[PDB]
Ligand SMILES: CC(C)S[C@@H]1O[C@H](CO)[C@H](O)[C@H](O)[C@H]1O
Ligand SMILES: CC(C)S[C@@H]1O[C@H](CO)[C@H](O)[C@H](O)[C@H]1O
């Protein structure tokens with residue numbers, strides 16, 4: 225959840241918002257080790273329930289998200305249903321565990337390509353055009369993350385938009401991401417420079433991936 | 436419906452057969468002027484019902500077709516249901532009126548392209564990949580006619596098969612078509628040669644489109 229003023233501005237300037245719970249357990253092995261553990265349901269529930277209690281009156285928020293990269297656990301299904309029950313005015317989405325689980329109203333993959341499939345075991349990233357028509361699938365598809373803008377990037381961006389415009393159910397996505405997470409440091413001449421992972425003695429680190 | 440021996444051979448050699456009623460009113464304006472006319476329901480019913488009564492015991496026949504290029508009329512819906520009722524063991528298909536009407540269990544367009552949409556009024560031919568995922572659509576797609584092999588042709592044939600293999604619901608199609616409808620004529624020297632439309636004084640005619 226963001227600083228409270230953010231929603232006020234989106235309400236007034238006009239931007240659709242996906243409000244997301246502060247829940248990410250990416251480094252766990254497997255990714256859903258905590259989210260499928262009932263012992264952690266309480267902690268997770270508050271991160272979801274208290275967000276809804278705080279932001280449910282903001283018109284800018286149109287979709288609720290159960291968090292990010294935490295695999296797919298039984299706790300997600302429980303909280304998915306809690307939200308659907310308490311606030312039926314907004315769809316609920318969550319990408320963990322394959323982007324099309326029982327815990328999401330929207331197929332919301334991250335970095336699924338336009339025409340090329342990436343058949344990873346258990347959690348494949350199908351071509352988005354293909355994903356829509358898989359047997360029995362009927363939901364809209366909006367990428368929660370796509371077009372990783374790291375450095376000299378965004379090659380192939382037009383291919384996504386051509387598909388978005390051609391396929392009714394391909395309803396867009398959220399580019400990753402808005403601003404480089406570089407930090408200011410100062411050299412001997414007191415000149416400020418942009419720093420990334422590892423520049424503060426932090427280790428281990430993932431260097432420029434924060435930009 | 437074909438010569439009776441054809442079904443015998445298909446049963447024994449092994450070929451899936453689409454048995455089609457002898458009904459085509461392509462030349463009408465609009466194309467469904469007769470098929471939507473109840474006065475013509477009797478004549479049409481016999482062409483469908485008598486076909487089913489004759490070939491319903493052939494295992495090679497796996498799909499029934501209500502005919503060809505006769506637009507979409509109420510008579511089609513009536514006969515679609517008649518077949519569904521008397522023989523639930525075989526899906527019923529029909530391309531007329533848009534290839535995805537209420538008279539077909541299979542999206543069976545003719546010459547719909549792989550990636551390119553052909554937004555014709557009332558009866559558009561959508562890209563086959565796009566067709567499968569249109570809002571609310573769930574049926575399989577098998578082209579009743581594609582890759583018009585007229586003369587030096589079949590360019591782009593590989594594009595269809597790549598799509599067929601990638602998309603579960605794109606289950607193939609029927610190339611148009613098997614053999615040139617050329618007829619033999621003889622010159623002054625008694626030497627035989629292949630003739631087409633117009634070579635018999637027949638006029639008006641459509642020349643080489645029979646091949
Ligand atoms: C396979 C790893 C790179 S995971 C990858 O790292 C990215 C770095 O910007 C983002 O955080 C993505 O959301 C994450 O899935
Ligand atoms: C005249 C075309 C626009 S209609 C086209 O003609 C073809 C000729 O081989 C086939 O008969 C197709 O089935 C028919 O739709």
Ligand code: NA
Nearest residue numbers: 388391392394
């Ligand atoms: Na779209």
Ligand code: NA
Nearest residue numbers: 432433434435
């Ligand atoms: Na990053």
Ligand code: NA
Nearest residue numbers: 599602603605
């Ligand atoms: Na297929």
Ligand code: NA
Nearest residue numbers: 643644645646
């Ligand atoms: Na022809």
